[PDB]
Write a protein that binds this ligand. Structure first.
Ligand SMILES: Cc1cc2c3c(c1C)C(C)(C)C[C@@H](O)N3c1c(nc(O)[nH]c1=O)N2C[C@H](O)[C@H](O)[C@H](O)COP(=O)(O)O
Ligand SMILES: Cc1cc2c3c(c1C)C(C)(C)C[C@@H](O)N3c1c(nc(O)[nH]c1=O)N2C[C@H](O)[C@H](O)[C@H](O)COP(=O)(O)O
Ligand SMILES: O=C(O)c1cc2ccccc2[nH]1
Ligand SMILES: O=C(O)c1cc2ccccc2[nH]1
Ligand SMILES: O=C(O)c1cc2ccccc2[nH]1
Ligand SMILES: O=C(O)c1cc2ccccc2[nH]1
Ligand SMILES: [K+]
Ligand SMILES: [K+]
Ligand SMILES: [K+]
Ligand SMILES: [K+]
Ligand SMILES: [Mn+2]
Ligand SMILES: [Mn+2]
Lengths: 500, 500
């Protein structure tokens, strides 16, 4: 099976890429696995595969850390993301995001039901497993539980059956047969939970599948539109119908090659302690005492020699930056274009801890709009910050056509030199805020409202007659024939490879 | 003579450090020298010494580019700055800035007058030179003139004789015997010019010395206090009285080892076209038509085989970042401490194009103040933005004790995660602004007023009971004994030198 359609094949692809370290000696899931993974993520090293995890019994489980993190080289920086999508390992961010957006004006390709698959090689009923007895990692030393769920996909369906959502949301072990996790607005798992709670009749049928097709986990991380079933979006993106098997204990369908499947219910009434957790912005607040949603597990099914993917998230760079930030930015780009805004590209700079999105403006089109900064900022902010795709993003930076938004140095340059603080910005206090950002949920103001800004790094003539500067850089402040002479004579004169 | 006290010895020191490339083949001062230098600065390469400059006659002149730019290695990143100051080449920014501040509570060491020096080896009177006939560089293709003055020191004295100021301010050739240049408030060259203009009797006696003692050019770039004679500040910093010779045609004194000296007057009445110029923020606005101050040159004296230092300024990283930004930050640190503010460190992040300064707060002392963000931000902004040392800086970022302000990644992390836009900031519209920043002088608002902000990246408990988080990073979210185990086994397991 292809790497983008089968997690087990994806692990092999990483090994073949010389992008895997197989650790075959015993590693402790209490902190050691995650510490190694954290170090990998901070240094852009090879993904670790823990084949000998202290506490693994009867096949549950090995761990793969850093599945969507960065490679050290510039040439294949985003190669692990490219391997989720059948793209060349040298694919650019633009190419990755365009692949993730490609299904947005294609007909869905619904999934295919098959009678069995690898995820049914082993099962454990209600009397045979205990989630406290599995090698679930403690990921950060002050976490409030063992976070089994950092890179699996929750599967829930609307009461009417019409929308099946796939998404990543964290969850930790509560007891032998329950999890607690985040289920918060405006996320689709929360929207669907609310539908079941208003109906009031039953807990939500649920499954959580770990080690799913890589292309599926990418969509699971992306804010595709309300009511859109991720399975059919992934089918259209990949050009293939995904093969799904039915759960044993409910009528949901999971990917046939899933490494590990939990089946059970998401309560419409119960809660339990959840967190704290070392989060995407780089922080943990030890002892926070929040409540979260409560999941009951009725059955586990799994592949022989199952592998659990794990995100050891926090400071740069991990899946919470590469996937959450970039995929939100992609969706925001499309949203802006659907609202007739002249945006060509969008990216969430890593330097901003993926709290900013830079929006590259087609300034020819801007000029034809005959508008002003105040008016355009307000329009862009209203579109993005009133929509779910804008949830995680607190600062939008508008930049002209000279800026490569995928290059954080250039975004920072433009922001710092072209946006006058206050005058060139519009604050939004009456929009949903993202409480996970420390200055929101642990800050001076409302945890859930406001704290958003549009920062206009377009210069005045970009609205009127065109760019009126040249950069004071090698590229722009010297003629072509001189530049080429300098480069051609660089080593001859005495000064100092693409792949490396 | 020591490298920090003699430019010619500094050039040798760079050669000995394997930090120099001597180009002995012909190089054009029309753009080619500056293009090579620009490339050096963008890539942190070795400083270029142009020994064969097309148009050099009778000893005027060779060029040294990138005299205060960065080295590629982390270990000696700031080595060229350290070589201005007799510091080890591995000196940290903190060590450099502390050296530059050290003279602030020492008695001055006034300069020593000597009867002659190398700067008198050659002279050209009023009938023997033509500044249009010297190999003055065109530094950027759209510059409005040939910028002879990018790394020399202007010398002017108050009418009463009590204050002799040394400073860098740009100037370009106007005609055979005049320059035009920037002379703008609140700079000391402007303050002293205003004193002569109010007296109304004569043009300002002036000299411009190129290739001065490196320790002198560093002070020339620093906003030491009003009325303080840089020569005596440099004397105290270096522990040595600087040796100065009298000008031939006026009673000013120049460093005895100056490579090239212009003597003449700064007009109290005349102006001429100045700029545009590819400036420290990375821009040129071709055709801007400003007027600037006008200098008359009466005499040139110079060393045999004179060397003109040149800054090919613009996008990162050059002397306008390493020196302007860092030295302003140093002065701001001291200013804050003299105003009883609990600031330990200050740095202007390169990523901000040196328009921000991050201020590290001793939060134990902050807690004892029993204050709030709004009140403390306003106090810090009032101190810094009402003072000359704050002129160039438009955003102050307050950070707690965990942040290394000399590490821009960490400043950006703190800013992006701890400062709620709007609520955690105070705007200052009634302070002097820096018009060179594009969003000021080419922006939507007053070129000379406002556009400043204090951004508080202190978290709420930093004001009250203490930090209430741990970072989700390798350093903070794992115990010591685990971290050390992981590092000790890193290569054994299969994962990947200080000097490189
Ligand atoms: C890639 C990735 C995504 C998420 C998360 C993680 C990773 C690795 C954790 C490591 C588990 C940390 C976690 O905080 N986490 C997370 C989360 N969304 C939440 O509601 N809750 C969460 O706990 N997202 C983001 C969501 O996956 C996206 O916002 C997606 O758009 C949601 O899908 P949908 O609601 O649009 O269908
Ligand atoms: C290191 C350095 C400093 C400066 C400059 C340059 C370099 C390399 C140029 C390349 C020539 C570009 C130029 O724009 N330039 C410059 C300037 N100050 C100005 O008033 N005008 C200028 O044209 N400073 C900054 C000043 O040197 C400091 O602000 C110093 O504090 C002034 O001294 P003082 O007034 O405090 O005595
Ligand atoms: O745990 C975290 O990092 C995290 C929680 C969360 C909720 C919604 C969206 C993104 C998210 N990230
Ligand atoms: O409701 C609140 O006050 C609040 C929710 C929340 C979620 C994550 C982090 C901090 C938070 N604070
Ligand atoms: O030309 C430039 O980059 C520049 C001009 C100026 C004036 C004052 C302070 C710093 C400055 N830099
Ligand atoms: O006076 C003004 O309007 C003005 C001065 C100035 C100096 C440098 C750059 C742009 C500028 N604009
Ligand atoms: K999704
Ligand atoms: K702007
Ligand atoms: K000075
Ligand atoms: K704050
Ligand atoms: Mn969805
Ligand atoms: Mn001064």
């Amino acid at each position: 099976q292809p790497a983008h359609l089968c997690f087990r094949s994806f692990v092999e692809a990483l090994k073949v890429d010389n992008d895997l370290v197989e650790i075959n000696t015993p590693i402790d899931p209490n902190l050691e696995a995650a510490a190694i993974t954290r170090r990998v993520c901070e240094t852009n090293d090879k993904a670790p595969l823990f084949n000998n995890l202290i506490g693994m019994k009867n096949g549950l489980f090995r761990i793969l850390g850093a599945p969507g993190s960065l490679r050290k080289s510039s040439a294949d920086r985003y190669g692990r993301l490219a391997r989720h999508l059948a793209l060349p390992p040298t694919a650019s961010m633009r190419e990755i995001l365009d692949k993730m957006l490609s299904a947005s004006d294609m007909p869905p390709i619904p999934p295919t039901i098959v009678p069995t698959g690898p995820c049914k090689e082993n099962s454990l009923d209600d009397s045979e497993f205990d989630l406290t007895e599995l090698p679930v990692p403690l990921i950060h030393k002050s976490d409030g539980g063992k976070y089994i769920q950092t890179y699996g996909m929750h599967i829930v369906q609307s009461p009417d059956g019409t929308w099946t959502n796939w998404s990543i949301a964290r969850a930790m072990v509560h007891d032998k047969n329950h999890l607690t996790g985040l289920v918060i607005p405006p996320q689709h798992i929360w929207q669907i939970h609310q539908m079941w709670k208003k109906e009031g009749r039953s807990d939500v049928p649920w499954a959580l599948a770990f080690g799913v097709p890589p292309a599926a986990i990418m969509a699971s991380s992306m804010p595709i539109p309300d009511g859109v079933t991720e399975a059919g979006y992934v089918g259209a993106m990949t050009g293939s119908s995904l093969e799904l098997v039915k759960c044993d204990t409910n009528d949901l369908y999971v990917p046939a090659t899933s490494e590990i499947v939990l089946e059970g219910t998401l309560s419409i009434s119960e809660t339990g302690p959840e967190g704290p957790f070392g989060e995407m912005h780089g922080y943990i607040f030890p002892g926070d005492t929040h409540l979260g949603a409560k999941y009951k597990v009725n059955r586990i099914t799994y592949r022989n020699n199952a592998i659990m993917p794990m995100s050891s998230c926090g400071r740069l760079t991990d899946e919470t930056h590469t996937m959450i930030g970039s995929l939100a930015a992609a969706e925001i780009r499309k949203l802006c274009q659907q609202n007739d805004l002249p945006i060509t590209d969008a990216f969430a700079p890593f330097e901003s801890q993926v709290t900013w999105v830079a929006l590259r403006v087609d300034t020819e089109k801007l000029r034809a709009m005959k508008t002003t900064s105040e008016g355009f900022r307000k329009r862009v902010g209203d579109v993005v910050f009133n929509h779910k795709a804008g949830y995680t993003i607190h600062r939008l930076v508008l930049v002209g056509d000279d800026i490569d938004v995928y290059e954080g140095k250039d975004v920072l340059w433009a922001f710092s030199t072209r946006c006058r603080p206050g005058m060139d910005e519009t604050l939004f206090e009456d929009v949903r805020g993202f409480p996970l950002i420390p200055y929101m949920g642990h800050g001076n103001g409302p945890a859930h409202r406001g704290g958003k800004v549009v920062s206009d790094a377009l210069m005045p003539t970009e609205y009127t007659t065109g760019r009126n500067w040249e950069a004071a850089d090698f590229n722009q402040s010297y003629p072509e024939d001189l530049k080429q002479k300098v480069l051609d004579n660089w080593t001859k004169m005495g000064f100092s490879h693409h792949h490396h």
